[PDB]
Scaffold this active site. Sequence first.
Site, PDB file in Angstrom:
ATOM      1  N   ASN A  10      42.248  30.888  51.731  1.00 28.97           N
ATOM      2  CA  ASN A  10      41.322  32.012  51.714  1.00 28.97           C
ATOM      3  C   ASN A  10      40.023  31.542  52.304  1.00 28.97           C
ATOM      4  OD1 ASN A  10      41.184  34.782  51.080  1.00 28.97           O
ATOM      5  ND2 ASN A  10      40.288  34.404  49.058  1.00 28.97           N
ATOM      6  N   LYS A  12      36.689  32.497  52.672  1.00 27.34           N
ATOM      7  CA  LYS A  12      35.730  33.430  52.075  1.00 27.34           C
ATOM      8  C   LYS A  12      34.329  33.313  52.700  1.00 27.34           C
ATOM      9  CE  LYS A  12      36.122  32.560  47.621  1.00 27.34           C
ATOM     10  NZ  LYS A  12      36.377  31.627  46.484  1.00 27.34           N
ATOM     11  N   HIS A  82      40.797  39.823  44.944  1.00 27.20           N
ATOM     12  CA  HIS A  82      40.179  38.531  44.669  1.00 27.20           C
ATOM     13  C   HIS A  82      38.948  38.784  43.816  1.00 27.20           C
ATOM     14  CE1 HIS A  82      38.403  34.495  45.565  1.00 27.20           C
ATOM     15  NE2 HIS A  82      39.674  34.160  45.688  1.00 27.20           N
ATOM     16  N   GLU A  84      35.634  38.173  43.301  1.00 28.05           N
ATOM     17  CA  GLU A  84      34.318  38.718  43.640  1.00 28.05           C
ATOM     18  C   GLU A  84      34.410  40.208  43.954  1.00 28.05           C
ATOM     19  OE1 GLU A  84      35.886  36.460  45.877  1.00 28.05           O
ATOM     20  OE2 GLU A  84      36.357  38.200  47.117  1.00 28.05           O
ATOM     21  N   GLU A 154      44.610  34.020  39.385  1.00 26.46           N
ATOM     22  CA  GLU A 154      43.377  33.299  39.652  1.00 26.46           C
ATOM     23  C   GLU A 154      42.369  33.447  38.525  1.00 26.46           C
ATOM     24  OE1 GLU A 154      41.311  34.013  43.418  1.00 26.46           O
ATOM     25  OE2 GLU A 154      41.851  31.894  43.828  1.00 26.46           O
ATOM     26  N   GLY A 160      36.183  27.972  42.121  1.00 27.06           N
ATOM     27  CA  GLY A 160      35.013  27.289  42.681  1.00 27.06           C
ATOM     28  C   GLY A 160      34.106  26.586  41.697  1.00 27.06           C
ATOM     29  N   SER A 200      40.533  25.968  41.996  1.00 32.67           N
ATOM     30  CA  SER A 200      40.245  24.515  41.899  1.00 32.67           C
ATOM     31  C   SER A 200      41.464  23.634  42.196  1.00 32.67           C
ATOM     32  CB  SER A 200      39.593  24.123  40.554  1.00 32.67           C
ATOM     33  OG  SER A 200      38.290  24.663  40.411  1.00 32.67           O
TER      34      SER A 200
END
Length: 234
Positions: A10, A12, A82, A84, A154, A160, A200
């Site tokens: 991905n 991003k 996803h 966000e 996820e 992250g 991660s």
Amino acid sequence: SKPQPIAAANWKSSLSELIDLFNSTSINHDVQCVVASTFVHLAMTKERLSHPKFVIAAQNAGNADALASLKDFGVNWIVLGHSERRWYYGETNEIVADKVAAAVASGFMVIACIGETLQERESGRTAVVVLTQIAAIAKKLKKADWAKVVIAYEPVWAIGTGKVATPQQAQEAHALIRSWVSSKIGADVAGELRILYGGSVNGKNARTLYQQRDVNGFLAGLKPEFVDIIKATQ
Ligand SMILES: *CC(=O)COP(=O)(O)O
């Protein structure tokens, strides 16, 4: 035993060196690799990436005309839902499910992302949160549609943050999703369904996660260690 693994990168937010790396890498087992990119970076990825085990994916499109152009351009995969998209941009369970349903109707393979937040995890609401996210998606789809659907679990607290789900936690989550799909959609569908882990993942921990019963690959960053994560899908 397990269906074909997926390794999805991905992007991003150095791409060319990286694509050079992917083009030159022999991948010696069966796995679908995916490089998901933003609109602006899509035509470059599509021009430079030629490894036949790779496909390009778009991200977050919600307009049918926009789906149509992507198809036309030869993009057949899309990443949706996803984190966000949900916690910053305000995509609800339903909004994500309409986007998944639209993309399937337009002829895309869909990686649909689901996952709970830190609070939800700690208060014991992982299961209800994750199964509500995906029941929203399944309400807009037919049995037949699941052949075009891929689920990425996820955990938002693992995205992250440097915090990976232990193999135990990833497995429990994947098992719960699959056991819901087997119950609600069919055991044939559950068996063939790819459930990828996201959050991660690196060279080190990928292999160990992939050994788990219900893990079918990964969604990770577009970085040089993506090669290691691809290698881990055995
Ligand atoms: C799904 C995903 O792109 C996670 O990102 P990461 O920084 O946690 O690998």
